[PDB]
């Protein structure tokens, strides 16, 4: 201590470093290789390339570009591989963490929840798409001694289907009140409305204005409507 | 979940349910008793359409059923990320739980099957209140004897006796040789409660939980769902084993019989004095504890409340620890006092936000901070925290 | 608990009210802050 | 960006240009005793080293023709579409004040419309309870009210219904007794119907109305 | 059959839809040139033409937009507040005002407990004077003054979709009426 | 990190203050091979078009320039510094160092935030200016 200030007297892995530091390694070594003239001017277009492969494998789009040179490609692919392992095993790394009950600090709270829905909705799509493959796994012999277990129990029950609501029905509306309001308490605690759920009161208070034609409208949509928004 | 009981007026009828019926509580020939807990795993995730277009037909019109099925598929949307939903079930939509319930009843059918079925619920014309039967032939007909499914967790209860049990664990073992005594490796106690009041571990005991599972195991298909021993809890109640263990909800509770008090007790907050219909004497004791999931959770919570909050005022953090607090009281009522760590995180966790006003206030700390500046209401101007 | 801190007086002694130089406290009302803090945000502000 | 491409320093120093503010032996014994010290005491290019090595075959036109930039997520039509969707918000109407909801009158308000559109086409459990010092604010301006008449028994069945509706029990069916001390049947009507729940003591008072 | 084609499947899954009714048009008109070609000579360069605009129009609806330059936040500088109040622009900000009600909401009563409303996911929601200092002992709330401006209402795009929904499931019912 | 230019000589610097009167100037003062001083520069090269019109950012090494190391009393391997109409900006973060800047900030918006209060602050001549965010158990 005493040394350093006499001398200033007369003179005066991780999540964070890694994904930097493999950017800085990836673009050190492209802009070495390529030709000074046209250098510069493409660099920072070679940075977008790295941010757009780098969305694209956060979206699972398979980030099939027109024509390439081949090294690049392979280049760019490789850091998403690395890059891909370090980012999905801190993702798990640090949400033990949070379970635990250790301090990861704030954004990584936020952004771990990000991350590992990104991951949740990876292993749904690979679910569903492996289900396309293999098809239903049930099979007829099975799906068989499954159904005969209920129609055995419905036809000692007595048990009579239940029908279709009657377009002259007793309860519709005492049916269609308990619905709409159990819509509708969610924005009761609410002094301010944000713009979807202004809508859904505009929804909610044209279904008590207008039931007659609300009850057609399900009516319709229960015999018909097929196909339904995202 | 009836529309009539509310889960922790659950576990009491659950527990009134186990002592009420005849003689488990004698061991005195040979007899014994087991539980199961087993979530049914993946079950909406795992709903095929193929089959629930037919189940549904049996139930409803075809109308509904085909309306009910395609409103399924959709197409699934986060930001970039988008796929048709073919193969499990989005149980966002509001008629989502009553599927989720027929579903279920398909299942149950499969343990139960349709001779035990009809004795648990009775004749349409007569059925039965939640515990109870006709006559207590009945009961002790089959080695199932109470019975329920809270969404996908499952209890099971058998009574056994000798000439009943040493076939069950004849066959397991006889068809899962283990030479080197090896049942009791994976088998799963349960952490919260001390030595004296857990399962015992003895060859017998353990031998039958896993037949136990092993049977029913078999009886469920694995493409409806995936039954593992690892989220299945067994608890046995035999000469060796005076503890009757299960966990409800939130709830952990242990069931000792008047008769077997000898082995080393000792009172607690979460004490239920149970009453015999007829008797009318108190044949049992069964102590309430909170579960590791939902302490956790809480621990989880109140950090959530001190996170997510970079810049909020103080009235929101007092109002949301109310909140939570509240919570937790109203729903555990019995069980806190009996649980010391919940306690502990408790008190942990009140100095701790008082701690974030603190720091709110200034960066030095105090040396003392008068207590009526939390504690008054919100009215005379404090943050009326409890 | 107003009991347990002595009373709305020991409290009044905690706080400035005595300077509002309101002599009866019974007629008086706070104006909520979560609503105050609904006002403000009805303009159109920057995230600062 | 001018002054960054053109690069003459003069003479200057740099501080006093801007008018800025601020808010040998020995040394040789110590890099020897540091160099007796120093006697005795990366994987990432590793990876992409091999790779950088293989770019050299790229001829200049195919670095000349890079495609230049692509969006593939559309994140910028999301974005924008996000962004106006939580622009402004709103404020909620005054029909949401939770207090007023009951079921009855909206089913009975409801099915008439309804059964209307169709022949034309052929207090609350979560309230708390009344603070005794509001209620006691009601016991003062309704004391005030009674002792404003002695008569006019209006206001006796005033004070006894609506302290009836607040709390009832002891309160209402004493005021009752007291001021019905007699020609109007009205406060033996109320009487009656509140203070009973026996016989003997509804004939004790309908004897006395009578 | 044609969704089967070569034309179609070679491509990325997002630009199936958009080639089916490119492409059918496409096999129409070549169908229209068959009738009329004379059976002795039968001619293409027609479907050549028409592979050109197929193909090239797919690899443009495959093509992704081009990058964006960033926006830029406007300026901190605050402007100079302007007024105008007329019946139209009050009945504008009507929206985005609190009215008088629910501004006596935001009033806290000095010394006693608020009316709270248990909410439907059981947290109390004050309405600290909403209510008359008489009308917490009777418990009556109030009817008060109702403002009809502030009331919820439907986007341009969400009240066509609904009237017309509607419009359709009245011939749906007129159907099932005669039938 | 491309995005940011660079400033080679105190000239540059001095000149990069004097000759911008209507938006801040933003100095990061560091090296290219530390830890802290990228990350930064990654902060900083996302927010910089976003902020252009009321306020621009430069780079400074310390190696390449150890002129203002003495006047400025630069140490810890960055300090982001804030300059309008050639005075030295100050605003009191809750780091005790009412001057500069040290820690790495998290989240855009939070630095996007001190840019605009800083730019605000500094418009009426005031001094010192008070952050929303005060981070002090960073320092």
Same mark, same amino acid.
């Given at each position: ?230 | ?386 | ?48 | ?93 005054? %029909?949401? &004040?939770?207090? =007023?909801?009951?079921? /009855?009158? $909206? ?6 419309? @309804? !059964? %209307?559109? &169709?022949?034309? =086409?052929?207090?609350? /459990?979560? $309230? ?6 509001? @209620? !006691? ?74 | ?179 | ?139």
């Amino acid at each position: 201590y005493i040394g350093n200030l006499i001398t200033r007297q007369f003179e005066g892995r991780l999540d964070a470093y890694y994904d930097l530091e493999l950017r800085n390694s990836v673009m050190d070594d492209i802009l070495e290789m390529m030709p000074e003239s046209i250098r510069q001017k493409k660099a920072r277009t070679i940075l977008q390339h790295l941010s757009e492969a780098w969305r694209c494998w956060k979206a699972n789009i398979p980030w099939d570009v027109p024509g390439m040179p081949a090294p690049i490609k392979k280049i760019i692919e490789r850091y998403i591989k690395s890059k891909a392992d370090a980012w999905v095993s801190a993702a798990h790394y640090n949400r033990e963490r949070i379970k635990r009950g250790a301090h990861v600090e704030k954004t990584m709270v936020k952004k771990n929840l990000g991350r590992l829905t990104r991951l949740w909705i990876k292993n749904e799509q690979e679910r569903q798409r492996q289900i396309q493959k293999n098809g239903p796994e049930i099979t007829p012999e099975e799906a068989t001694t499954i159904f005969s277990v209920m129609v055995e129990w419905l036809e000692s029950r007595s048990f009579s289907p239940i029908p279709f609501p009657p377009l002259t029905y007793k309860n519709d509306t005492k049916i269609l009140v308990l619905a709409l309001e159990d819509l509708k308490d969610v924005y009761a605690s609410k002094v301010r409305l944000n713009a979807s759920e202004r809508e859904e009161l505009a929804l909610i208070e044209e279904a008590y204005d207008n039931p007659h034609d609300t009850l057609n409208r399900i009516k319709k949509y229960l015999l018909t409507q097929r196909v339904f928004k995202p | 979940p009836s529309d009539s009981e509310i889960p922790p007026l659950l576990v009491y009828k659950w527990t009134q349910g186990i002592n009420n019926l005849s003689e488990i509580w004698d061991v005195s020939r040979g007899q014994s008793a087991v539980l199961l807990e087993t979530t049914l795993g993946e079950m909406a995730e795992k709903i095929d359409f193929t089959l629930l277009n037919r189940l549904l037909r049996l139930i409803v019109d075809p109308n509904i059923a085909d309306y009910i099925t395609a409103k399924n598929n959709v197409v699934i949307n986060f930001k970039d990320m988008s796929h048709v939903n073919k193969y499990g079930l989005i149980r966002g939509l509001k008629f989502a739980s009553f599927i989720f319930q027929y579903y279920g009843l398909v299942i149950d059918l499969l343990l139960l099957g349709q001779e035990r079925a009809t004795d648990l619920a009775g004749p349409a014309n007569n059925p039965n209140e939640f515990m109870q039967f006709k006559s207590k032939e009945v009961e002790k007909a089959h080695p199932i004897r109470l019975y329920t499914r809270y969404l996908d967790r499952i209890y099971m209860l058998f009574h056994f006796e000798e000439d009943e049990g040493e076939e069950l664990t004849d066959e397991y073992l006889a068809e899962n040789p283990d030479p080197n005594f090896e049942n009791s490796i994976g088998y799963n106690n349960r952490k919260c409660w001390p030595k004296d009041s857990r399962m015992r571990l003895i060859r017998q005991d353990v031998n039958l939980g896993r037949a136990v599972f092993w049977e029913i195991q078999s009886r469920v298909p694995t493409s409806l769902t995936s039954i593992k021993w690892e989220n299945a809890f067994v608890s046995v109640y035999s000469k060796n084993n005076p503890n009757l263990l299960f966990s409800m909800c939130g709830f952990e509770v242990r069931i000792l019989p008047r008769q077997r008090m000898e082995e080393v007790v000792s009172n607690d907050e979460g004490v239920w004095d149970l009453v015999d219909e007829r008797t009318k004497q108190r044949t049992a004791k069964a102590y309430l504890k909170v579960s590791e999931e939902e302490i956790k959770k809480f621990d989880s919570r109140i950090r959530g409340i001190l996170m997510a909050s970079g810049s909020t005022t103080f009235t929101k953090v007092a109002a949301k620890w109310n909140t939570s607090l509240i919570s937790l009281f109203t729903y555990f009522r019995e069980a806190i006092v009996a649980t010391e760590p919940l306690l502990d995180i408790l008190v942990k966790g009140e100095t701790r936000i008082q701690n974030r006003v603190k720091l709110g206030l200034n960066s030095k700390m105090p040396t003392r901070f008068p207590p009526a500046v939390f504690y008054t209401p919100k009215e005379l101007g404090g943050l009326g925290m409890i | 608990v107003i009991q347990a801190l002595g009373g709305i007086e020991t409290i009044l002694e905690h706080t400035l009210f005595k300077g509002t130089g309101f002599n009866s406290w019974e007629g008086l009302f706070w104006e909520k802050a979560s609503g105050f803090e609904d006002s403000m945000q009805f303009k159109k502000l920057t995230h600062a | 960006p001018s002054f960054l491409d053109q690069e003459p320093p003069a003479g200057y120093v740099p501080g006093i240009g801007r008018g800025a503010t601020g808010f040998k032996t020995l040394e040789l014994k110590l890099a020897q005793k540091k160099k007796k010290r120093a006697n005795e005491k990366s994987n990432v290019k590793r990876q992409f080293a091999d790779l950088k090595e293989s770019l050299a075959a790229v001829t200049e036109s195919e670095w000349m023709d890079i495609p230049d930039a692509t969006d593939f997520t559309r994140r910028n039509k999301r974005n924008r579409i996000q962004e106006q969707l939580n622009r402004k918000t709103y404020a909620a109407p005054d %029909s949401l &004040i939770p207090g =007023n909801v009951d079921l /009855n009158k $909206l089913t009975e308000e409801r099915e008439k419309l @309804l !059964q %209307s559109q &169709i022949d034309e =086409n052929l207090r609350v /459990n979560s $309230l708390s309870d009344a603070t005794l010092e509001d @209620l !006691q604010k009601m016991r003062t301006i309704l004391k005030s009210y009674r002792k404003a008449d002695p008569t006019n028994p209006q206001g006796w069945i005033a004070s006894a219904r609506l302290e009836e509706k607040a709390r009832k029990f002891s309160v209402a069916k004493k005021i009752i007794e007291n001021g019905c001390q007699p020609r109007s049947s009205d406060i033996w009507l109320e009487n009656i119907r509140l203070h009973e729940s026996d016989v003997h003591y509804c004939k004790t008072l309908v004897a006395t109305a009578i | 059959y044609l969704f089967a084609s070569d034309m179609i499947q070679k491509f990325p899954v997002s630009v199936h839809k958009q080639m089916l009714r490119m492409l059918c048009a496409k096999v129409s008109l070549a169908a229209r040139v068959d009738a009329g070609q004379k059976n002795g000579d039968r001619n293409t360069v027609l479907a050549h033409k028409w592979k050109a605009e197929l193909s090239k129009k797919a690899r443009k609806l495959s093509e992704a937009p081009s990058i964006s330059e960033t926006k830029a936040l406007p300026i901190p500088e605050d402007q100079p507040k302007k007024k105008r109040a007329g019946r139209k622009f009050r009945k504008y900000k009507e929206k985005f005002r609190l009215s008088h009600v629910r501004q006596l909401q935001n009033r806290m009563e000095f010394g006693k407990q608020e009316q709270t409303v248990l909410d439907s996911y059981g947290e109390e929601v004050g309405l600290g004077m909403s209510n008359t200092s008489l009308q917490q002992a009777v418990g009556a709330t109030s009817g008060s003054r109702r403002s009809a401006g502030n009331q919820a209402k439907l986007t341009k795009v969400m009240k066509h979709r609904i009237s017309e929904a509607n419009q359709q499931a009245d011939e749906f019912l007129i159907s099932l009426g005669h039938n | 990190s491309v995005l940011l230019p660079q400033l080679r000589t105190g000239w540059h610097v001095d000149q990069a203050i004097v000759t911008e009167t209507k938006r801040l100037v933003v100095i990061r003062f560091g090296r290219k091979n530390d830890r802290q001083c990228m990350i930064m520069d990654e902060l900083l090269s996302s927010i910089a078009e976003r902020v252009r019109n009321f306020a621009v950012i430069y780079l400074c090494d310390i190696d390449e320039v150890s002129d203002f190391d003495e006047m400025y009393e630069l140490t810890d391997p960055m300090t982001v510094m804030f300059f309008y109409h050639n005075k030295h900006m100050m605003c009191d973060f809750g780091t005790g160092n009412n001057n500069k800047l040290n820690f790495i900030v998290d989240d855009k918006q939070e630095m996007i935030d001190i840019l605009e209060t800083i730019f605000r602050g500094a418009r009426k001549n005031k001094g010192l200016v008070v952050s929303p965010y005060d981070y002090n158990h960073k320092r």
